[PDB]
Subunit: 336 residues, 3 copies
């Protein structure tokens, strides 16, 4: 595929939305290969991660933790414009696990504050993939400061089950799970700092215990609950993309299932079926497809329940519709 | 199906047995869909989890850690009478990962001391599934106090491998693996408590380290050894169902293999074959089918060997039969 | 086979090479079943594992951490002469996860210093498999002192994909991954000891935290980087065997992929494809097949990036050939 051929390809500017929502895209590919264009500005900002007012100096793609989901189709080109404003203090870059060469793009995208860059790569393999910042010598620090996201490379023909039947979701959500390592003082109280770099040494010591102080979805404890609870209706088919750029996770839809789960995140690997709890290793994304059958609230969790309910890794679904007494019924409600 | 059609179905009352054993069942379903009735009384009890006498207040389905294995076939209904006696001190409920709606059943089964409830759900998918107590605001604590078990939903046609060939076991065992988090004093010695609640605060601290003090099969270090060692014979086909409601495990039969392993625990997902070590993520059950070929003693372990041999996650099998020198032989015994 | 048939099989002595290199072998078996003979001498020695002079009393098959890769074909026999020199201080043995009976061989190979032993086993199942020392009552201690390696049991007809098309590698590397648990004094300085057994009690205390001090490839921080980077050329097909005898890992080729990954390490289990990050549970080996498409430096890591970049679990590949701008191009280089 020649430079001339690539330059002749149609282009499409895409407008990214904040997780857990996903920008407008089509499941089945519309026409031949294109160059899909994205722009993200890096925001270094304080985020409050729990109800005790614990802060993290987030290093945030598009200003969010996680960074937003980019959707392309197999054999499209993803062309990202990454911007590091003068109002930042650190060098940043970006590695796409979906990309091939130069460490996933990080070797070609190192930008000081004030600089920008434009990277283009061919999305040759279908699936969900992590992307994350990885500056040489400070890789884990940037990743666990929230500097990671994910992309989805859909097949041209959209999603299919193991045996070739089409799988079409009505809804898609992107859950980015984040392990945070927040230093404490001698009273076991979390510390605050004036600059990202001020926390480095204290944080690194915590990182080395391999024990996160917080494990959260969408940047904070309770982030995807209440006003930000995910929604569905009985009969709706929903795709849940889940990433974790540094640490293992075991997602589980409480009250539901993973009807089809690409646990590895890769669409050419046939999915697992009828899943109670799936497993996504650190440095990967997975995706699960589920048709809701019951109304009510669901909890969506990392099913190490200490991580879910002590450390923060719990989100809700609010589902509307009619209760099914065949699937489940209270024959005798709680009573003496 | 309608309420009338479910009412017309035959009902079978099952007598549960204590782990690692499993109640009488047939592998291939007998007749059409049944309503399968189980009763479990919750017992808040002091249990000893090691040879030193370290004690935990178990919150125990049917009085055991793990709770017993319930066995039904696909499209059967599981009807559970759950009873929380007046002598208990906490509210409990049950979540069936196999079930659909109301958080797996937890939203419909919250019973205080002196209360009972009857939950029915349709067993729509074949596999092994975790069940566990999950009271809102107190979820992980009930689980890591041993309030969990598993069920198996057999395919109506019994087990098959990935290519449609039937797999009939001679015997089945259920290994519930438990992570315990036991408070220590300033000498590093484990603390005892008067009531379940008294332990709460100290325990949650240990829980947050994500580092169990004990990792055990059937409620205690060495519980499945000595005259409680599991047993087999050369040529015998054994299904080992393994569950972990809170934390990852990596089961390994030392001296053997997992000939067919549904690592995800779901029978519609083709099993892995010829396994040395398989992986079960916290909040799931898996199952391994193995035909014994050599006599002698085997250790069945979680293959983090520190967890197996320091923390308690080791069981034995005693196997009768003739040694196969073709498979293995000492050409030269330990000698100068 | 019959007694005479086994006795009549060819015997072939093979010379081992140190990891990450692998001894001469054919992918397609050459002739009928063979008794493949190997010799390993056990070395107990102090090794430095980091840039700060930190020591471990290594317990090392063939004098290396990991022990060397042994390569046979399915239904060959592996015949190991294991030697424990009189200069050593500890009893050792060997467990092959690939073998059937006597705990994988440990029961038949317990050799005191001044002793040797010859074990033969039939390699009945194709795959990569952990081996490790395992003396009753001191199993994890020998393993986390580096006394572990792997073997590869190739299909007689070499490797295939899920469709049965041949996969032939140009090169094979073996990355053995090691969790070390090095004691520290109260100032946080790593302690040193005169003999292996002097470190035992302190080391077990560190092991029980389940938190390694170091996670390394080939026995040391940086052992497979710089001038010891592994090598390839664009268009070369490489198999990467990876083992972890005690603890989970999640291998990732930074800048590349795992085109075919036998994550379970078993060749009769179809490989996953297009992998970003794969998962190998503690107590197993896995294998990844990749065709390099881009020149330059790659980082091969455990993608818990803290383990990779704080704790030592990072390797390099140095790759020759011509850049492919179709796959990846810098449209605009880092600029103000
Ligand atoms: Cu960054
Ligand atoms: Cu990465
Ligand atoms: Cu309970
Ligand atoms: Cu659950
Ligand atoms: Cu040893
Ligand atoms: Cu082992």
């Amino acid at each position: 595929a020649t430079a001339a051929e690539i330059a002749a390809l149609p282009r499409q500017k895409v407008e990214l939305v904040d997780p857990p929502f996903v920008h407008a895209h089509s499941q089945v590919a519309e026409g031949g290969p294109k160059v899909v264009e994205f722009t993200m500005v890096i925001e270094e900002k304080k985020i409050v991660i729990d109800d005790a007012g614990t802060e993290v100096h987030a290093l945030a793609f598009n200003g969010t933790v996680p960074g937003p989901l980019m959707v392309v189709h197999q054999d499209d080109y993803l062309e990202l414009t990454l911007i590091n404003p003068e109002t930042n203090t650190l060098m940043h870059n970006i590695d796409f696990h979906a990309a091939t060469g130069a460490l996933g793009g990080g070797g070609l995208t190192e930008i000081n504050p004030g600089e920008k860059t434009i990277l283009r790569f061919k999305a040759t393999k279908p699936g969900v993939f992590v992307y994350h910042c990885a500056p040489p010598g400070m890789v884990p620090w940037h990743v666990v400061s929230g500097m990671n996201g994910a992309i989805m490379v859909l097949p041209r023909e959209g999603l299919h089950d193991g045996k070739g039947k089409a799988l079409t979701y009505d809804k898609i959500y992107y859950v980015g799970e984040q392990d945070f390592y927040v230093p404490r003082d001698e009273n076991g109280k979390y510390k605050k700092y004036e600059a990202p770099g001020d926390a480095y040494e204290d944080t690194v010591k915590v990182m080395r215990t391999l024990t996160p102080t917080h494990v959260v979805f969408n940047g904070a404890v309770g982030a995807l609950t209440g006003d930000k609870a995910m929604t569905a209706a009985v009969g709706e088919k929903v795709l849940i993309v889940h990433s974790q750029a540094n640490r293992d996770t075991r997602p589980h839809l409480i009250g539901g299932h993973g009807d089809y789960v690409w646990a590895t995140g890769k669409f050419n690997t046939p999915p697992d079926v009828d899943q109670e709890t799936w497993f996504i290793p650190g440095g990967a994304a997975g995706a699960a497809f589920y048709t809701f059958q019951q109304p009510g609230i669901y909890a969506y969790v990392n099913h190490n329940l200490i991580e879910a309910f002590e450390l923060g890794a719990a989100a809700h679904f609010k589902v509307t519709g009619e209760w099914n007494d065949d699937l489940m019924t209270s024959v005798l409600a709680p009573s003496g």
